[PDB]
Amino acid sequence: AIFGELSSLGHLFKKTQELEILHEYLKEVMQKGSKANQRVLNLATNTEFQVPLGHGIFSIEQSYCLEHAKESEKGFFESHKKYVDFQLIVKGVEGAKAVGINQAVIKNPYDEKRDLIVYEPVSEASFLRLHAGMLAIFFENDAHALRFYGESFEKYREEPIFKAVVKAPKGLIKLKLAA
Amino acid sequence: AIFGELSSLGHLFKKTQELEILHEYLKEVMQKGSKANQRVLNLATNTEFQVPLGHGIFSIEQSYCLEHAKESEKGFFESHKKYVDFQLIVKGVEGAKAVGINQAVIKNPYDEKRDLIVYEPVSEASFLRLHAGMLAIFFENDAHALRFYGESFEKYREEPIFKAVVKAPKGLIKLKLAAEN
Ligand SMILES: [Zn+2]
Ligand SMILES: [Zn+2]
């Protein structure tokens, strides 16, 4: 898994044509007052909206309240095969747990239509505190569970967060420490 | 920051001889009975040992007990400029906190001699639970603090962990998501 500020991770998206619209989209969604930003912040709670980005890439814009205490056995632990997740928090704070799929127990085997494997919870997993402007990238080996709150951002149990989950085909996204 | 199982992250170390050399060391240290593995596991507690790997790359092999409760304001929060950290846990479990340098308050400005910026603690930062075989990679934008314990691995307060922090010159490391088009 990768995580960090979108504004520090721009170099990840340069010099590739397929990624160009995507990077533009991530920046637009974060820009206060932009069309994409206004659209995302106008989402009714517990709804989503899909935006096509070309080359098999699309964004799932969503808003919801946090559900699970970080110190609990709750949460929906999942991983994917076709797609890499680019999770961008637009407003609010979200807790994410992440663990390697080889450390997790499969509950529901891969469902191709939903591009989804479901795991038993791993409560003690790494915990990412994703505030607005932070990007978390989850690959095939990253089991992840979202919608956690911690004591410092408990208000988002009743005040919705806003985010985009960009799905990009893994065939396009090949993480390397070299170009 | 990047984190994951070393055995799931092999694809990262492709297409340069220098990354290949780095990867070879990381794998050797995890292999029970290897020269590097024995060297790391024989360290006395609270000591470290430096191993040059070529190309300006070197490993700081270390052993120590965990010091700070995760729910505390303790911890030495730092970032670097010249080097990228490859932190590999060889035995035990370690908690690491990581936060973007833009959310941290500078305490000690950059010291070029030691390649170090020191920050005020960010106790609520993301928390990485690094068990044996896990790798955390910290780049210049990643402020990080080590030696945390959580309740699920509190035994390493009294029993030492073993790890390597491999320092790679920034010029060797270019994080990319796709081929350049
Ligand atoms: Zn996902
Ligand atoms: Zn460091």
Describe the structure.
Chain A is mostly beta strands. Chain A has one domain. Helix content of chain A is about 10%, strand content about 45%. The first copy, chain A, contains 2 helices and 13 strands, in the order E-H-H-E-E-E-E-E-E-E-E-E-E-E-E. Chain A has a 6-stranded antiparallel β-sheet with strand order 1-11-6-13-3-2, covered by helices on one side. A 4-stranded mixed β-sheet of chain A has the order 4-12-7-10, with no helix packed on it. In chain A, strand 8 and strand 9 form a beta hairpin. In chain A, helix 1 packs across helix 2. Chain A is globular. The two termini of chain A are about 20 Å apart. Bound molecules: zinc ion (2 copies). It is classed as unknown function. The entry lists the keywords Unknown function, Pfam Family PF04074, Zinc binding. It forms a dimeric assembly.
Q: Could you give a quick summary of the protein structure above?
A:
Chain B: Zn(2+) binds at residues 78, 80, 85, 144. With 179 residues, the first copy, chain A, is mostly beta strands. The first copy, chain A, has helices spanning 17-30, 35-41; strands at 2-5, 47-54, 57-64, 68-69, 77-79, 83-91, 93-100, 106-111, 116-119, 126-131, 134-138, 142-149, 161-169.
